[PDB]
């Protein structure tokens, strides 16, 4: 039933704020944590209990913690109108950054403040009876969430052992780039992030910036739309915990279902009904047309073509008014196509599931209001052309050791470049080796 | 977060003292040192740059230090004269005689013990301490000297801060100074081992600033100092305001430099407007873009096309979008392709701050790190050698105790830095 | 429900175009303070003349 | 030339500026009224105010000194000689150049009544954008010099703007006056007192035994020694001036500045609508009676 | 689809003045920059020619320049002159001379770059950039000389756009200088090679449409200038308004040349009738098509009966009938058949615009094709030939720096020019 999410950095914390201020209009919390309702009886209402739990008194508060090194965005969210919400042990700041320096982090930093946060985490679940998982928000682009990212899931994976960690992750875009640094930071993430995690999504901002100037109409976007969007696929991917439906899908489903080898846990996510209120009143929105809109490149949240490469496992959520009859012609129709290919291993490529609440509309954002949406998640090939490019610039920089007297200075081994650099390309040969066909090999 | 700032010699306290009325005004404390701002996120960060005295009271966390007290009553008598600590004034009794040896070996000694206790007992009090914000001329006498001195001992008892160095060098042209090319020498020759980052000012390239953009009459010294108190203030508004994506001074010196001995910077702030054409033209970030880079607005004399950007970071203040701010800087690295080098994947860092200064709806400032200011150095040396063959002036420092072999150590050092910058600038894809 | 989604929509526009005056208003009072300038430098060389 | 309404200006300013009966004015007068700071040439700055003052004895001081004034064709003439040399001028139009020139220069119009303070915008219009968030300055009549004077006490940024000057009474509007206000006459800047932050009332009388005031508008740091007696009268603390009987409250907005605001703060946008019409569908949901999109929770 | 105008001499920035003034007022832009239109119409294509500066403004994107700047404050001083952005004025410090070897060489190469920055800063604000026009005198000195040149550097640097001119070029009969057979035949060796398409005026025809055809007494500049700022504004009219057949400068130049070297049009303007006549003939389009190829209302000294058309375009603004217009045109090729080149089977394009300039019904411009023109380049080299067989001033050009070479090979590129439109006269075939 409850998940509680841990929110690392600049991007975390952001990306959180979207994340709770959604769950609490979804639910009906009020920001001081109240919950009105006028009913005497048929108070027997338990759905909240994925993301709070109530005291004595009867207020609500939430799953989570905000950790980060610099203060200012940590005391942003102390004086901002969510102030009663959290209890103030919860929004945890140290006193400076990681100066975009994974060695730091890892390193000098994150050793101090790690022992805190593990405590935190402790005292969260304490308060608990069925935790089936850890959501954990970040970008590898910067040097506290790379280092204290690693050394925290490390932690965790050891103390906590077969309990779920499922990541939401922001890799550096192809082109877009806003600091120097961030292929050493992106690669050393990646080593680390390979062997403790149970699921990483990949987004990239310029897939994200790409959809918000097609689909939606909006000339100068900003992180807070990236965010929302970001919120409402999490939500999405939840609701299946929280309402009735006719096929419902708990979390270790997705990873038993969409992973074939341990190793192989990456999955690109994309979300169908992004329109605009204006566009809304001009189109119905059946089932067969949102299916064929998760499997459009247009529809991407990451800069990578599926039709570069083959897909092992499709996860298809569907949400609100859809009937299953519906669900299996649409499948039926998208297996016809000659532009999608499965794996000749993987003939059940899909696995479905239908639930009835329909998405909710956030007062002030961006996206219509819609009676029926999919969001999809899959695994494909297609994602080691995304590590490539970051390897080609990795070795563009490391071939004159560019920036290195940095991490060198601040502790770390150039021998650690080498080994991280060298597990990447053993995964991009797995992703090779793996995606040859059974035929040829006789 | 606290910075500590120290002001030497005459240049360096008139600058000092346009700042701290930029920095007061901007965070609405009166000369008085009584709060009256309007907004608790002027208050929020005031800790930053100001100690709390008993119920209300700010002051300033800067040390003042010349050779004759004429500069100290000048700014005492100033209008915000009276905020600054008593205390916190240190004078010698004679002059440097605009001479090196005097300010680092004669009247250097004498006081420096004072300075070094002033700065620890400011510097203790902070409960985090940030990096030191130096400012000085390199042309004169006890700036030189006395600055390069205290930067010594305080990167001996704070290795582990940050120190920044805010430097103004000698024009060929406007020749204060007979013996400008020896305190030149000297002091780059003291700020290549000891600075952390280093930013050089020519005041012919603030000359031409005023000129040519905004076209004034009859420029005065208060106007130069306002570009660099400008300037100075912009570089650390992102440590003391919110924003979508902080920066902080270790973030830009990461980024910035490549290797520890290329840490010379150069400075441009963009939306300077002309007196006539303000209706005309409304603020936008192609705008600032487009005037950022354009070398009349750029601080020194060497131009940006005689050489190559290694990297370059802009400060964005202002509500404003990241698309495109990171499109710009893509579309100019990509159109401009020559002048940036190719080893490295992007070049450009950016960050945006809310919070614009007072009366402009946005504002950008600049660093670049390029291998046109070799040329600067350059110049100085030729000029060095000249004098230095004949022995045209020595006799004073000499007779103060120099050793000779000091002036050709400090001419090859500057020699291998110029030698160091130009490998860079010239290497081409082979 | 998607009707009242506009009318916020509206309402925001409303609010940009007043803060859009804003800055102009903002602009032409810094014109007016470098006009003040140039009057006092003009001051002051007429009465050393 | 000049049309017929520059006429009737003129002839407006000519018996305005006219003391006693006699058709004659004195030239301190005419230097006492005339406003440099309205002069074209000075507002877009390439001319000394001081420059105005030769010109002003040159062309008027060879018959003041002899026929001890200026008449009236001496006045209309001048004004010919204005309009000649504002014929050739760079303004894209003449006639409403020449009209608001004359207007600016002669100082004629509608005044605040207390100080003589010409208004920017209509005193009973609310204040627009910029003006809704700029201090305003405490300003009264000196004493010493006589009203008519223009010179003026001045205490600077102690007003806010959060009032519309239209409800006060006739005889206090002039009281406060914007920064851009004061150009044009003399002034004399008093010294603050150390204190808090905090805001004070201001009250006054219309009637024997009616009072009304306006909410927190002055800053506490108005020191109140410096003033005169009536205006510390005027100025009381704000439960003090609660607890006096049958008092009422002029409206008062207070407006957002656009200059101190985050990006976060867009967040928590509409929601306790939001909420509360979700907690009613979800109490609907609950009692039944639900038809279409329901609750589907536990 | 954003046009450019380069506005050159004394001869462009008063054509300028006059353009900018009809412009503004077909689009209901006030003096002040304000716009105070009444229809949606109007607002719903103006950035073609503005851009839009804060709080309403709009600015026209327009670049004036000459070497000495007595026209530019006279331009200033005009009623519109406020509306130019201050920064797009561009002057020297000494004249032209009246020497076409200066303007080109001297002051020309002096100048240029600061000229190319500001284009190119204007050009590259476009979302997406249409053609330059291009306004300017040949028998100047700064006009012909640094027009030319700047043509020039714009084809190196934007040779996918189009460029477009209108020139003024002199006469045999009313000169103003002795030295115009050497500006002009210098101009037109470079125009040729640089311009996509380029139309031709002789200022004895504005005398003559002035004094004949609207019977003025004392006619001045203005009004030539105002029959050109007609037909300038009339070409483009068609791209920035809606219309039932839509036309562009790209079409028009595609159907208008066969051949690359034959890029030299003739121009009329037809709705004109003097104030004591309009009340005796009502507007119909057989009377506009009747005026229109009328060769008394044509803009060049040569006359049609003595040529050939190559190929002729019309563009019509009002609310009409297609019908009307294409039995106009087919019944004129009829009847007229020996004066039209027969391997074309139909010469003429047609294009209707809804909108039609203020205070007229309907109107047509015509631009022509037409062999005649090969008569007055003749003359001018006649006149060049005849003073350069003496070096009759030759020593000026010789002392700026000029190989007497360049002479020989201007006049054999503009009698090839001739010889070209010669042969495609040839009138019969066999
Ligand atoms: N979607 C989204 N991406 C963001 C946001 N802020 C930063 N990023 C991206 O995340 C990367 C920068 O990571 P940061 O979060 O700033 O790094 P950090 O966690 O602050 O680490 P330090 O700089 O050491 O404090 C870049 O790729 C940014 O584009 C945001 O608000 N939304
Ligand atoms: N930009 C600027 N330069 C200054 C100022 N005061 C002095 N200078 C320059 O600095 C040099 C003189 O150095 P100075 O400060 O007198 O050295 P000191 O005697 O050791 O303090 C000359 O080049 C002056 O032009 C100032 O206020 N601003
Ligand atoms: N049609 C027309 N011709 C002009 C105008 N002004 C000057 N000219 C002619 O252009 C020639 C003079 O060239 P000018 O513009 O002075 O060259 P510049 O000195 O380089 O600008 C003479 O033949 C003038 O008669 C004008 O406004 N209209
Ligand atoms: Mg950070």
Redesign the pocket.
């Known amino acids: 039933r409850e998940a509680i999410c841990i929110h690392i950095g600049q991007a975390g914390c952001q990306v959180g704020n979207a994340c709770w201020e959604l769950f609490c209009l979804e639910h009906g919390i009020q920001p001081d944590g109240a919950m009105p309702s006028d009913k005497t009886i048929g108070v027997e209402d338990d759905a909240f209990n994925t993301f709070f739990s109530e005291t004595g008194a009867g207020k609500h508060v939430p799953r989570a913690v905000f950790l980060d090194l610099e203060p200012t965005v940590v005391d942003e969210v102390r004086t901002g109108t969510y102030r009663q919400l959290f209890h103030p042990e919860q929004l945890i700041s140290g006193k400076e950054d990681a100066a975009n320096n994974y060695a730091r982090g890892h390193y000098t930093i994150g050793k101090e403040i790690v022992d805190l946060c593990l405590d935190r985490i402790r005292k969260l679940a304490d308060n608990c009876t069925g935790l089936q998982g850890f959501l954990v928000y970040h970008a590898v682009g910067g040097g506290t969430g790379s280092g204290l990212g690693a050394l925290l899931l490390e932690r965790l994976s050891v103390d906590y052992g077969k309990k779920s960690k499922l990541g939401y992750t922001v890799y550096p875009s192809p082109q877009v780039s806003t600091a120097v640094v961030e292929p050493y930071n992106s690669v050393l993430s990646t080593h680390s992030l390979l062997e403790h995690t149970d699921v990483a999504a990949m987004l990239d901002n310029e897939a994200i910036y790409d959809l918000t100037r097609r689909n939606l109409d909006i000339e100068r976007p900003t992180y807070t739309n990236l965010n929302r969007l970001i919120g409402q696929v999490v939500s999405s991917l939840t609701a299946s915990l929280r309402f009735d439906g006719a096929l419902n899908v708990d979390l270790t489903e997705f990873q038993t279902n969409l992973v074939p080898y341990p190793r192989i846990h990456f999955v690109l996510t994309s979300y169908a009904p992004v329109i605009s209120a204006e566009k809304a009143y001009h189109e119905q929105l059946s089932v067969s047309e949102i299916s064929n809109a998760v499997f459009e490149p247009a529809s991407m949240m990451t800069k990578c073509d599926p039709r570069h490469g083959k897909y092992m496992a499709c996860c298809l959520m569907y949400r609100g008014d859809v009937v299953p009859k519906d669900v299996n012609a649409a499948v039926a129709t998208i297996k016809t196509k000659r532009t999608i290919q499965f794996v000749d291993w993987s003939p059940t490529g899909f696995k479905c599931g239908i639930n009835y609440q329909p998405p909710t509309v956030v007062p002030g954002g961006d996206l219509a209001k819609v009676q029926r949406a999919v969001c999809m998640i899959a695994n494909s090939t297609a994602i080691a052309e995304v590590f490539a490019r970051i390897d080609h610039k990795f070795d563009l920089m490391y071939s004159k050791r560019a920036f290195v007297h940095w991490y060198v200075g601040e502790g770390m081994e150039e021998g650690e470049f080498s080994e991280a650099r060298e597990d990447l390309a053993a995964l991009e040969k797995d992703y090779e080796e793996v995606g040859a066909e059974s035929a040829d090999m006789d | 977060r606290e910075i500590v700032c120290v002001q030497a010699?005459?240049?360096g306290n008139?600058?000092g003292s346009k700042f701290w009325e930029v920095i007061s005004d901007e965070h609405g404390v009166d000369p008085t040192g009584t709060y009256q701002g309007d907004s608790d996120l002027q208050l929020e960060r005031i800790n930053v740059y100001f100690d709390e005295a008993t119920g209300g009271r700010y002051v300033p966390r800067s040390v003042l230090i010349?050779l004759e007290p004429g500069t100290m009553d000048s700014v005492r008598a100033g209008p915000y004269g009276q905020i600054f600590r008593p205390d916190n004034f240190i004078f010698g009794q004679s002059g440097?005689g605009?001479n090196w040896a005097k300010g680092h070996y004669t009247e250097g000694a004498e006081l420096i013990d004072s300075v070094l206790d002033v700065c620890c007992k400011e510097a203790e009090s902070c409960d985090c301490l940030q990096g030191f914000q130096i400012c000085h001329?390199l042309?004169?006498?006890?700036?030189?000297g006395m600055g390069t001195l205290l930067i010594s001992k305080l990167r001996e008892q704070y290795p582990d801060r940050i120190m920044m160095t805010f430097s103004?060098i000698?024009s060929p042209k406007?020749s204060?100074?007979v013996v400008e090319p020896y305190n030149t020498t000297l002091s780059v020759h003291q700020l290549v081992e000891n600075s952390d980052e280093s930013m050089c000012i020519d005041?012919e390239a603030?000359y031409d600033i005023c000129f040519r953009t905004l076209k004034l009459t009859t420029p005065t010294?208060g106007d130069?100092?306002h570009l660099v108190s400008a300037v100075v203030s912009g570089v650390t508004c992102c440590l003391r305001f919110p924003g979508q994506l902080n920066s902080d001074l270790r973030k830009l010196a990461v980024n910035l430099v490549p290797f520890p001995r290329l840490h010379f910077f150069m400075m441009g702030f963009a939306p300077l407007t002309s007196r006539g054409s303000q209706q005309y033209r409304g603020l936008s970030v192609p705008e600032l873009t487009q005037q950022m880079f354009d070398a009349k607005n750029m601080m020194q004399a060497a131009d940006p096309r005689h050489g190559r950007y290694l990297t370059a970071s802009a400060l964005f203040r202002g509500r404003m979008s990241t698309k495109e701010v990171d499109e710009q800087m893509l579309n100019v690295q990509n159109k401009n392709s020559s002048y940036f080098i190719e080893w490295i994947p992007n070049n450009i860092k950016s960050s945006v701050c809310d919070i614009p200064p007072k009366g402009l709806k946005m504002a950008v400032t600049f660093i670049g790190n390029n291998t046109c200011i070799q040329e600067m150095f350059r110049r100085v040396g030729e000029q060095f050698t000249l004098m230095f063959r004949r022995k045209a002036f020595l006799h004073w420092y000499t007779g103060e105790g120099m050793d000779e072999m000091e002036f050709t150590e400090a001419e090859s050092n500057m020699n291998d830095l110029v030698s160091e910058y130009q490998q860079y600038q010239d290497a081409t894809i082979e | 429900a998607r009707f009242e989604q506009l009318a916020l929509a509206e309402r925001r526009k409303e609010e940009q175009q007043r803060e859009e005056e804003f800055f102009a208003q903002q602009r032409v009072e810094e014109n007016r303070l470098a006009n003040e300038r140039a009057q006092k430098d003009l001051e002051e060389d007429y009465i050393r003349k | 030339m000049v049309t017929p309404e520059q006429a009737a200006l003129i002839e407006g300013a000519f018996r305005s500026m006219d003391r006693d009966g006699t058709g004659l004015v004195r030239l301190e007068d005419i230097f006492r009224v005339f406003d440099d700071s309205r002069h074209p040439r000075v507002r877009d700055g390439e001319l000394a105010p001081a420059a105005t003052r030769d010109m002003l004895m040159h062309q008027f001081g060879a018959t003041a000194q002899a026929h001890g004034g200026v008449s009236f064709d001496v006045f209309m003439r001048f004004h010919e000689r204005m309009a000649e040399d504002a014929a050739v001028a760079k303004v894209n139009d003449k006639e409403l150049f020449l009209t608001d020139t004359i207007i600016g220069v002669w100082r004629l119009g509608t005044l605040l009544q207390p100080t003589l303070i010409r208004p920017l915008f209509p005193v009973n219009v609310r204040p627009s954008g910029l003006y809704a968030t700029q201090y305003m300055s405490l300003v009264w009549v000196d004493e010493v010099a006589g009203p008519g004077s223009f010179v003026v006490h001045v205490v600077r940024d102690v007003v806010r703007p959060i009032f519309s000057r239209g409800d006060l009474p006739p005889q206090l509007r002039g009281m406060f006056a914007y920064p851009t206000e004061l150009a044009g006459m003399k002034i004399i800047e008093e010294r603050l007192q150390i204190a808090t932050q905090r805001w004070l009332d201001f009250v006054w009388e219309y009637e024997e035994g009616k009072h009304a005031a306006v909410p927190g508008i002055i800053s506490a740091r108005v020191d109140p020694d410096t003033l005169p007696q009536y205006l510390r009268d005027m100025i009381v603390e704000h439960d003090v001036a609660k607890a006096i009987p049958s008092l009422f409250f002029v409206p008062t907005s207070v407006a957002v500045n656009p200059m101190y605001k985050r990006s976060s703060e867009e967040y928590g946008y509409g929601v306790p609508e939001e909420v509360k019409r979700m907690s009613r569908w979800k109490d609907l949901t609950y009692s039944g009676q639900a038809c279409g999109l329901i609750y589907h929770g536990r």
């Open positions: 010699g005459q240049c008139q600058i010349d440097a605009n001329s042309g004169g006498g006890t700036g030189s103004i000698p406007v204060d100074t005041n603030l010294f130069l100092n």
